[PDB]
Amino acid sequence: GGDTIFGKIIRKEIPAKIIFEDDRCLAFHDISPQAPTHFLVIPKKHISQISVAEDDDESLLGHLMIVGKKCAADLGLNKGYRMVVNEGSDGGQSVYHVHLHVLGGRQMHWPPG
Amino acid sequence: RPGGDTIFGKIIRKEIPAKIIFEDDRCLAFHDISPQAPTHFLVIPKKHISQISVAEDDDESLLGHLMIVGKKCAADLGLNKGYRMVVNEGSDGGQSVYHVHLHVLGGRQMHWPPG
Ligand SMILES: Nc1ncnc2c1ncn2[C@@H]1O[C@H](COP(=O)(O)O)[C@@H](O)[C@H]1O
């Protein structure tokens, strides 16, 4: 699970509002939401950042997106949404555990930050 | 047609020009014509999928491949300080081209919220 706050969430050591879980990922609402709906999908495998993801992780990363789109549908995001992965300082990555943001429930703007 | 009817299908089939960064049997990476950061490119599947909301379960590996190719291209382009990957879905996402694609933006500080 790794040595970050997302590791603690995966291990159930600290609370989060969990939307979905399977054997390889977890989806939960962001504690600092930037839209009326704002959740994260994260792998249980501790990949610190997308830049170090291995080729073998390919389908796992895609799994985050499929889970993300399924959760968005369940949460009634029928007008759309934005998915985001942040890498490093320029990317504004807040936690060094790969996470896919899903934001919706309002018009998302351009540029995306 | 392989690649679909959108402008991105035409790019895939070399019918309209693009500044291509990477190409394989599954995907294509090329620079965005309206960049929102000093470096701003797209990674798209060669298979037409209109939007992420209609992607099939068995599209998992392909979607992941877009991300892996995205991060490799970013490294090759020297985005060592980081970058942001984005998918715009539907009206609230601001989607304008209905062929699934991953934006990769870098070369400046990205801000929060992401739009
Ligand atoms: N012919 C083209 N070549 C490269 N990028 C394009 C082209 N046409 C549109 N785009 C970009 O594709 C994106 C489509 O918007 P969206 O669907 O919200 O991602 C925008 O960033 C456009 O600038």
- DSSP structure string for A24-78: SEEEEE-SS-SSSEEEEEEESS----GGG--GGGHHHHHHHHHHHHHHHHHTT-T
Helix (H) or strand (E) holding B42: strand B39-45
Tell me which DSSP letter residue B84 carries: E
Q: Please, which experimental method was used?
A: X-ray
Helix (H) or strand (E) holding A86: strand A81-87
> Of B16, B54, B11, which is closest to residue B29 (Cα–Cα)?
B11
Answer CATH for B1-115 from 3.40.50.12280, 3.30.1490.20, 3.90.1150.10, 3.30.428.10? 3.30.428.10
Cβ atoms A99, A41 nearer than 8 A: yes
Residue the block writes with tokens 């889970």: A67
> Of B40, B101, B115, which is closest to residue A112 (Cα–Cα)?
B115
Report which residue type is found at B56: E
Cβ atoms B114, A84 nearer than 8 A: yes
Q: Which superfamily does A1-113 belong to?
A: HIT-like (3.30.428.10)
Distance CA A43, CA A46 (A): 7
Distance from B70 to chain A by nearest Cα, in Å? 9
Resolution in A: 1.5
> Of A31, A34, A15, A40, which is closest to residue A98 (Cα–Cα)?
A40
Distance CA A71, CA A29 (A): 11
Query: Token pair for residue B68?
Result: 């892996």
Q: Which residues of A touch B83 (CB under 8 A)?
A: 87-88, 90-91
Distance CA A101, CA A64 (A): 10
- B20-23 and B27-31 strand pairing: antiparallel
Cβ atoms A105, A96 nearer than 8 A: no
Tell how far the Cα of B99 is from the centroid of ligand 1, in angstroms: 10
Rounded-to-10 torsion of CA A29, A32, A38, A39: -30
B80: Cβ below 6 Å to ligand 1? no
- A100-104 and B102-106 strand pairing: unpaired
Closest CB to A51: pick one of B75, B92, B115: B75
Is A99 assigned a catalytic role?
A: yes
Distance CA A108, CA B17 (A): 29
Measured from the Cβ of residue B41, the count of other Cβ atoms closer than 10 Å reads 26
Tell how far the Cα of B43 is from the centroid of ligand 1, in angstroms: 11
Residues of A within the annotated binding site for AMP? Answer: 30-31, 86, 92-94, 99-101
Q: Which residues of A touch B68 (CB under 8 A)?
A: 53, 55, 57-58, 61
Cβ atoms A64, A25 nearer than 8 A: yes
Rounded-to-10 torsion of CA B57, B29, A101, B59: 0
| CB pair distance less than 8 Å for A83 and B65 | no
| CB pair distance less than 8 Å for A109 and B115 | yes
Secondary structure percentages of chain B, helix, strand, coil, to 5 = 30, 25, 45
Q: For residue A84, what are the contacts with CB-CB under 8 A and spacing of at least 6? A: A100, A101, A103, A112, B84, B85, B86, B87, B114
> Of A47, A38, A35, which is closest to residue A6 (Cα–Cα)?
A47
Distance CA B4, CA B54 (A): 15
Distance CA B69, CA A92 (A): 20
In the three-class reduction of DSSP (H, G, I as helix; E, B as strand; rest coil), residue A100 is classed as: strand
Distance CA B112, CA B86 (A): 13
Domain residue ranges of chain A, discontinuous segments joined by +? 1-113
Distance CA B62, CA B44 (A): 10
Distances (CA, A) of B23 to A10, B14, B52, B65: 36, 12, 21, 12
What is the arrangement of strands in the sheet containing A25-29, beginning at the earlier edge strand? A18-21, A25-29, A37-43, A100-104, A81-87, B83-89, B102-106, B39-45, B27-31, B20-23
